[PDB]
């Protein structure tokens, strides 16, 4: 076998770290490179700064100009908040300098103190020696910024430029006789970034002044890239107003500029294994089983420093740049290979106390993954994420072609293939139209690596790769240390449009795509066979507008325990009992699926638009993660949302979470007070259906009719009966307060509607009708539609506030229930302590409807409506009619 020294030398040219295991050896090499770079920077900066004033204040209307490759580029002015206000470039052997504002117009005023240091910078630009005079009348070409202001700027610094009187950016012969090229964002050119890089490499020295305040500049971004620099994030220096004060010493400035982008102290710590044993872990707090340590002193600053390395490397991942195909990238390459070597040695699980050195180095190496390369290495141990099935997944030797629908203007969607660990994958987009695309790997949210919990650092921190930009009809080569599910990220797309995806070298995880109204009998049998082969650790299910990214063993667990091995019924109930139930309850336009007859009739009798795709279009993809861990708790809300028990079509948590992404403010009582209440109609309706379809009684005690009754009879005794019942029921700001008592309000109307239609099966239609009503209120043309919607008295469309101190949800619910029931429902709103605005009371008044006297529906069960008892509440409060 070769030596690790021979392995590392060969890995440095190609990127093939497969056989690279000696991370201390790679770390010694990095240490040698970092010290060389720091010595070179400290010579250059000492010459530039001398002992002149460092004072430099670019103001709020300016931009940050950052280095990129640490071996070619470095800061010039770092502010006291650590923002890089100007950067030096030596890209491609040239000399360049970039300012985040037009410092040349400020040398006679707000930045007079910077003028001598700028003189030295130009002298370094023009001659490569900060202490060598420029020649009298040296030729300066000024492009993209006012020539007179720029030249007088240089004259204010004590230089004596002469106007080159030609464009050294676009005119090659001007460039060979100009001594300096000053650039701003007014430039014009074809291939603006390549041209800049070429003048720089031919030896034209370039000074760049950002001319657009705190705005970004597309032209400035291209100029910066040509110099091997990059523009700061959106907003620039507006908030921070960073600057360099007079108090700044040269020594301090030299120290920061020597270290920037190569964290020397971290390299020393990695070489020496001198990781901390004294973190005060007692300062960690738990929250629904999720330990975090943001208050352990020192930890946040250690985390921030590692984030910086991750940001620097991921910038190349996101641009689809392969550092191993770029010249002069030794430092970056070393960082990436060291991390690849650490990944060979990782063993799980680790503990933040019992295993500090392995924990802390792993924490660093997890943040340094280079994804754009022709070869790389698999991490040996994949811990709680995956195992031997993922490692040994077979890959396709030939190019596969997939057609993908992008259902919305922006999002991501599962491609249906996986990167295998350490196996080169090549991907290509075609037929994109106007959509902008990127490929990504996996969908884990970062909270689901529970590395702060005792002995739970058992998987990588960053299983979801950064989004890797794809340009149409240009292949990109990927190697992932982990393997992962391939996502396509898109923006500016046309809903319903297709994309073509070509990919070579990818694995095929079990994949099921069903679309409403088509023949899936083949796709399902394909999917069962893949499940039975037991070749993969991860799978995906696309069904309608729902994408499930799931650990195989979690789903087979749910199919064995709750469905007895019957995959077919599992899929039917996933589609029909869970997904369709919710989206039908919410009255979305489901393809090939008409509205039920009693909904169609109500909508027609009211002259409502209940079918147009513009008002009732299905929302975008809802994503679900089924994993060993969650962002927060055992399950966390969002898109994707997380769950850890498995996947149960009849499960309460499944419909609760989907319900959250279907909440609308105008159907919430007291705003956030109903934040964990109004989405509950989806699990509630599912359970009522499950008891009547299948005879299974799930969660029969969730709706606390008895206790809501108790809080109601008490509050209504007060001298303000509304404000009375309110403070018992809705005042409590606890995010799960009175949760089963507040649900009793929402189901009140189901029982009421069921009676009103004289049909026990129609009660839930009221929420569908309110959902249809709500979307018309939200989106329809106001003047033309407010009449039919029961909003005729409103000059303007009502508000959509979610605040608990708003009436907007109370109002809409009162109006919608009153319009739909054709009864004034203010007595029952007051009985529940629901205060509505005078405009909404004005509107209900104008209906000229018979008052519905305050009522209450009581029951001793949640799911069985046949035992429900109606109480007249208008003349006092009757007794609880059970037993």
């Amino acid at each position: 076998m070769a030596t690790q020294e021979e392995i590392l030398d060969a890995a440095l040219v190609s990127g093939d770290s497969s056989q690279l295991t000696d991370s201390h050896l790679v770390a010694l090499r990095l240490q040698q490179q970092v010290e060389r770079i720091r010595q070179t920077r400290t010579q250059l900066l000492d010459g530039l700064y001398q002992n002149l004033s460092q004072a430099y204040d670019p103001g709020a209307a300016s931009m940050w100009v950052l280095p990129a490759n640490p071996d070619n580029t470095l800061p010039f002015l770092i502010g006291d908040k650590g923002r890089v206000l100007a950067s030096l470039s030596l890209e491609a052997g040239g000399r360049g300098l970039a300012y985040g504002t037009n410092v040349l117009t400020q040398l006679s005023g707000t930045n007079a103190a910077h003028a001598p240091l700028l003189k030295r910078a130009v002298q370094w630009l023009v001659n490569g020696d900060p202490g060598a005079a420029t020649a009298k009348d040296f030729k300066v070409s000024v492009v993209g910024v006012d020539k007179t202001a720029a030249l007088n700027g240089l004259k204010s610094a004590g230089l004596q430029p002469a106007d080159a009187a030609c464009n050294a950016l676009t005119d090659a012969s001007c460039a060979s006789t100009s001594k300096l090229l000053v650039l701003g964002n007014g430039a014009s050119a074809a291939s603006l970034s390549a041209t800049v890089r070429a003048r720089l490499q031919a030896g034209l020295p370039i000074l760049f002044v950002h001319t657009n305040g705190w705005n970004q500049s597309s032209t400035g971004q291209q100029i910066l890239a040509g110099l091997g620099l990059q523009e700061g994030p959106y907003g620039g220096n507006y908030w921070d107003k960073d600057r360099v004060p007079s108090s700044r010493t040269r020594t301090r400035s030299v120290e920061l500029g020597g270290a920037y982008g190569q964290d020397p102290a971290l390299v020393q710590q990695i070489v020496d294994g001198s990781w901390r044993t004294d973190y005060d872990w007692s300062k960690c707090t738990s929250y629904v089983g999720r330990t975090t340590c943001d208050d352990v002193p020192g930890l946040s600053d250690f985390s921030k420093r590692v984030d910086v390395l991750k940001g620097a490397l991921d910038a190349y991942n996101q641009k689809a740049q392969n550092l191993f195909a770029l010249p002069g990238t030794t430092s970056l390459r070393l960082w990436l290979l060291w991390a690849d070597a650490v990944r060979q040695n990782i063993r799980y699980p680790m503990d933040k106390a019992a295993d500090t050195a392995r924990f802390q180095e792993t924490f660093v190496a997890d943040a340094i993954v280079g994804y754009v390369r022709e070869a790389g290495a698999a991490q040996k141990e994949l811990g709680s994420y995956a195992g031997q099935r993922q490692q040994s997944m077979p890959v396709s030797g030939s190019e596969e072609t997939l057609t993908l629908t992008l259902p919305s203007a922006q999002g991501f969607t599962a491609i249906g293939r996986m990167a295998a660990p350490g196996k080169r994958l090549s991907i290509r987009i075609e037929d994109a139209g106007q959509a902008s695309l990127a490929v990504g790997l996996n969908t884990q949210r970062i909270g689901s690596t529970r590395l702060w919990n005792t002995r739970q650092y058992d998987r990588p921190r960053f299983l979801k790769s950064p989004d890797i930009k794809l340009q149409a009809n240009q292949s990109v080569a990927l190697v992932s240390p982990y393997g992962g599910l391939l996502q396509l990220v898109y923006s500016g797309a046309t809903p319903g449009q297709t994309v073509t995806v070509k990919v070579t070298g990818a694995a095929s995880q079990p994949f099921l795509d069903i679309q409403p109204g088509e023949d899936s009998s083949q796709a399902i049998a394909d999917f069962i066979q893949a499940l039975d082969a037991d070749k993969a650790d991860w799978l995906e299910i696309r069904s309608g507008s729902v994408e499930v990214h799931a650990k195989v063993e979690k789903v087979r667990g749910s199919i064995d325990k709750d469905y007895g091995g019957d995959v077919q019924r599992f899929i039917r109930e996933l589609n029909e009992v869970f997904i369709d139930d919710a989206y039908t309850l919410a009255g979305f336009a489901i393809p090939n699926q008409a509205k039920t007859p009693a909904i169609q009739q109500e909508c027609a009798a009211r002259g409502w638009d209940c079918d147009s795709e513009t008002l009732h279009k299905l929302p975008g993809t809802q994503h679900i993660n089924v994993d060993q861990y969650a962002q927060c708790g055992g399950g966390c809300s969002g898109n994707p949302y997380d769950q850890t028990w498995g996947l149960n079509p009849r499960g309460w948590g499944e419909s609760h979470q989907l319900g959250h992404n279907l909440q609308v403010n105008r159907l919430k009582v007291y705003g956030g007070r109903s934040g964990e209440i109004s989405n509950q109609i989806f699990p509630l309706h599912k359970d009522w259906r499950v008891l009547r379809e299948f005879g299974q009684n799930l969660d029969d005690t969730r709706v606390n009719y008895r206790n809501a009754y108790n809080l109601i009879v008490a509050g209504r005794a007060e001298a303000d009966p509304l404000a009375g019942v309110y403070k018992r029921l809705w005042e409590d700001p606890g995010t799960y307060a009175l949760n089963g008592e507040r649900m009793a309000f929402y189901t009140q109307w189901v029982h009421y509607w069921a009676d009103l239609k004289n049909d026990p099966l129609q009660g839930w239609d009221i929420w569908t009708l309110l959902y249809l009503h709500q979307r018309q209120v939200d989106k329809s043309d106001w003047d033309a539609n407010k009449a039919a919607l029961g909003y005729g008295t409103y000059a303007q469309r009502p508000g959509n506030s979610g605040d608990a101190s708003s009436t907007d949800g109370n109002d809409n619910l009162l109006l919608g229930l009153s319009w739909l029931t054709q009864r004034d429902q203010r007595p029952t709103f007051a009985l529940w302590g629901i205060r509505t605005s005078a405009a909404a009371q004005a509107q209900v008044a104008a209906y000229g409807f018979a008052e519905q006297p305050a009522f209450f529906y009581a029951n001793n069960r949640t799911n069985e409506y046949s035992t429900v008892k109606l109480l007249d509440m208008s003349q006092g409060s009757p007794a609880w009619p059970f037993p």
Binding site: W214, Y234, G235, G236, Y238, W239
Partner: peptide, 5 residues
């Protein structure tokens, strides 16, 4: 103008 926070 101002950037949106």
């Amino acid at each position: 103008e101002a950037p949106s926070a």
